[PDB]
Design a protein around this ligand. Structure first.
Ligand SMILES: OC[C@H]1O[C@@H](O[C@@H]2[C@H](O)[C@H](O)O[C@H](CO)[C@H]2O)[C@@H](O)[C@@H](O)[C@@H]1O
Ligand SMILES: OC[C@H]1O[C@@H](O[C@@H]2[C@H](O)[C@H](O)O[C@H](CO)[C@H]2O)[C@@H](O)[C@@H](O)[C@@H]1O
Length: 373
């Protein structure tokens, strides 16, 4: 089966291009959709850093003129990119391995361009798409609509969001002296191109951790939490009817009934949600994995001291209070109507609404991706 892909520019002036990349079903082979509606499957190149030998930029009709509609073949690990005025430079490495534009590295050929992307997957069970602010927010916000069985819509960042986000974060940096302003990327014309989450600014310095930005942001708060739960229980509700598990800190290990163990975390762990006690290990039981997500979420939201039982009984109003918190997440949530801002933002108290930026349908007919408003 297939379905229609509709690319639209609602209101921006001039020229916008879209790119569709992914892996085709089972072959695992990199693949790009072509302006003419056909598929381009590159062969492995003769050298690294080889320019994409076919032009796969898809020109969008003018703002308001309607959509470019083509046939979407099934694929996974897929993306839709947009870029204004220019095109994007893609490359090939021996494999074939597609070299993707790196929003968070300043030497990248596209670093100064105005571009964005969202991620999707289309297998025979469903089309699943996702607007996510876990990594970046851009001056080219994407919204989408999926028609099939149901109709699902995901609202974009509103016009101007990325400027507000950049200003709020610079304002934060002015007060706490932390490198929040370095997450901003401004072109040559003064305009804001994107803002990136702290982990994307920290990962360069994983090599040299003694120079990592933000390395000591959470250090005091973490020690406060660990000392609290040396003398009283931390109750984590696994939810879904699985009930709660109580934990205590012995020395530097937080241990829950069932022998689930978490070492003292670092600011790095909290921001990545994937190191220290939050590293994903396939050798972990499901309870251990439930505990991990909820504890990472609570540190990001700074509710570990205020709420000994969580997430049930907490609300969004409890999140991101005080000087030391995940201000990236706080500010993105303030300036966006829906979508996640950090890797475990999906943790929510029972009864609270789903605020994920995903849309999915088991029988997709048209997948509309748009820019502008
Ligand atoms: O910016 C988000 C991250 O993109 C990552 O690539 C995604 C995953 O591999 C996922 O499975 O597939 C989607 C496309 O459907 C990709 O976007 C990953 O490469 C990260 O480095 C990157 O920060
Ligand atoms: O669309 C890309 C994003 O897809 C995500 O993984 C999906 C969900 O887990 C869903 O339940 O199952 C579908 C498979 O049909 C997955 O595509 C999401 O977890 C991201 O990693 C990814 O960027």
């Amino acid at each position: 089966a297939t379905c229609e892909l509709a690319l639209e520019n609602k209101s921006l002036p001039g020229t916008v291009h879209a790119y569709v990349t992914g892996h085709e079903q089972g072959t695992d082979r990199w693949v790009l959709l072509r302006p003419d509606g056909s598929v381009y499957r590159p062969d492995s190149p003769g050298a690294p850093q080889t320019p994409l030998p076919v032009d796969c930029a898809i020109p969008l009709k003018g703002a308001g003129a309607g959509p470019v509609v083509m046939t979407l073949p099934q694929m996974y690990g897929a993306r839709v990119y947009f870029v204004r005025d220019d095109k994007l430079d893609f490359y090939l490495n021996p494999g074939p391995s597609l070299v993707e534009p790196a929003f968070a590295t300043p030497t990248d050929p596209n670093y100064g361009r105005t571009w964005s992307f969202c991620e999707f997957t289309f297998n025979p069970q469903q089309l699943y798409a996702n607007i996510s602010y876990v990594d970046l927010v851009t001056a080219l916000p994407i919204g989408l609509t999926l028609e099939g069985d149901s109709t699902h819509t995901v609202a974009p960042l509103p016009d101007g969001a990325v400027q507000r986000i950049a200003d709020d974060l610079t304002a934060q940096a002015a007060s706490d002296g932390q490198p929040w302003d370095k997450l901003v990327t401004r072109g040559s014309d003064g305009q804001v191109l994107r803002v990136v989450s702290p982990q994307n600014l920290m990962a360069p310095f994983f090599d040299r951790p003694d120079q990592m930005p933000f390395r000591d942001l959470f250090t005091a708060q973490i020690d406060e939490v660990w000392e609290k739960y040396r003398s009283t229980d931390l109750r984590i509700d696994l939810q879904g009817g699985r009930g709660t598990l109580s934990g205590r800190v012995s020395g530097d290990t937080l241990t829950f009934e069932g022998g689930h163990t978490f070492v003292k975390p670092t600011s790095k762990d909290i921001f990545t949600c994937n190191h220290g006690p939050f590293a994903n290990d396939p050798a972990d039981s499901d309870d251990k994995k439930a505990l991990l997500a909820r504890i990472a979420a609570g540190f990001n939201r700074s509710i570990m001291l205020s709420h000994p039982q969580q997430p049930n009984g907490t609300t969004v109003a409890d999140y991101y209070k005080g000087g030391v918190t995940n201000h990236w997440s706080r500010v993105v949530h303030a300036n966006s109507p829906i979508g996640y801002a950090f890797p475990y933002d999906d943790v929510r108290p029972d009864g609270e609404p789903d605020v994920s930026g995903a849309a999915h349908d088991g029988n997709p007919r048209r997948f509309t991706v748009s820019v502008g408003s």
